[PDB]
Ligand SMILES: C[N+](C)(C)CCO
């Protein structure tokens with residue numbers, strides 16, 4: 194097995210976050226593209242397990258299948274305090 | 288023109304209210320006209336695919352104004368506030 | 383079991399072809415919506431087995447799984463003489 | 477900026493040519509750069525998903541000019557004229 198890497202036209206190897214053709218990918222310090230949950234500077238993001246792209250404004254099923262986590266439009270995971278569920282059930286996040 | 292879809296069984300009986308056809312659920316009003324969008328069925332809300340009429344279930348659908356989302360349980364019913372338990376790390380649970 | 387029917391706002395029951403909200407459906411003479419292959423006035427069309435809508439500009443797998451039939455943009459089935467397969471393999475239809 | 481995707485195995489060997497990763501096929505040029513779009517591999521043509529790089533198979537894809545379609549066999553190879561047998565009623569068969 195192995196991993197995916199990315200090098201811009203100038204030969205620079207991508208490490209960390211990198212916008213690649215309208216999508217965002219996260220590479221560890223060695224350049225290896227990461228998939229799944231990633232904690233970057235005390236903040237959580239979710240990278241598609243298939244093509245590795247960051248998911249945003251979406252709900253992703255918990256591991257224990259007990260519930261869902263919401264990823265804000267910028268990709269960051271929303272905390273409980275950020276939610277305001279209105280009486281009818283409308284889920285709002287800040 | 289404009290109109291509505293209806294379903295009559297082989298016996299000739301016009302479908303009305305909830306009806307399960309070919310493994311999908313549909314809701315017809317009192318006049319047999321297939322409903323789409325939000326439908327209130329005795330205190331609870333449901334959502335029928337706006338384009339195909341089948342009841343949506345276990346899905347989050349964006350709000351009309353786009354300000355938030357709504358969640359439809361696996362039984363089709365719309366989860367209202369009392370049913371939510373948003374855990375501290377953000378894990379959303381519905382019962 | 384039963385079938386789907388359609389009545390416009392004026393109470394007229396649809397029979398034959400009917401454009402319904404950007405899609406086309408075929409109803410037999412008794413009003414019952416048809417799905418699958420349909421022969422109308424010596425010409426073949428294919429109505430989606432799921433939602434009954436006519437498919438156009440698409441290839442649909444044969445029953446015997448031996449090949450595919452091509453439905454032109456207007457929904458009608460293309461005959462052999464209508465095809466011109468270019469050397470590289472480009473499939474063109476008239 | 478602009479650039480290219482590459483794949484190095486855990487051993488450090490740069491993937492080149494055809495490579496099957498996580499159950500999908502990809503094609504890297506001589507410089508290890510992942511190819512997308514049409515690729516000629518020894519007399520035959522293949523098509524790699526323009527957005528994700530994986531080889532398309534058993535699929536009809538619209539032509540660039542939109543004038544016709546192309547068919548990719550289940551093994552990825554592009555079917556050329558000699559392989560087509562269009563039956564009289566319109567049944568398209570490929571071998
Ligand atoms: C080492 N690589 C060839 C992968 C980078 C481009 O120079």
Ligand SMILES: C[N+](C)(C)CCO
Pocket residue numbers: 230237270376
């Ligand atoms: C990534 N986890 C879901 C495991 C942490 C809680 O956010």
Ligand SMILES: C[N+](C)(C)CCO
Pocket residue numbers: 281325332365
């Ligand atoms: C309360 N609902 C939002 C479900 C009905 C539409 O107004």
Ligand SMILES: C[N+](C)(C)CCO
Pocket residue numbers: 295296297298299387412413
């Ligand atoms: C009057 N209908 C044709 C709708 C009933 C027989 O199915």
Ligand SMILES: C[N+](C)(C)CCO
Pocket residue numbers: 292338339340386432433434
């Ligand atoms: C006939 N169906 C109800 C299945 C299609 C919705 O337009």
Ligand SMILES: C[N+](C)(C)CCO
Pocket residue numbers: 305312362363
């Ligand atoms: C799930 N349904 C509400 C559609 C069935 C009970 O009538």
Ligand SMILES: C[N+](C)(C)CCO
Pocket residue numbers: 293318319389393
């Ligand atoms: C007989 N229908 C009620 C189904 C048609 C509308 O008048």
Ligand SMILES: C[N+](C)(C)CCO
Pocket residue numbers: 419426459565
């Ligand atoms: C509808 N059939 C495919 C059976 C006839 C040949 O076009």
Ligand SMILES: C[N+](C)(C)CCO
Pocket residue numbers: 470514521554
């Ligand atoms: C012959 N192909 C069309 C497959 C190559 C692009 O020109």
Ligand SMILES: C[N+](C)(C)CCO
Pocket residue numbers: 198223224484485486487488
């Ligand atoms: C130089 N690389 C980091 C690309 C090889 C080790 O996997």
Ligand SMILES: C[N+](C)(C)CCO
Pocket residue numbers: 197243244245481527528529
């Ligand atoms: C990293 N993948 C090659 C899987 C995504 C294509 O952009």
Ligand SMILES: C[N+](C)(C)CCO
Pocket residue numbers: 494501551552
């Ligand atoms: C189907 N492939 C051509 C990708 C495998 C043989 O190398």
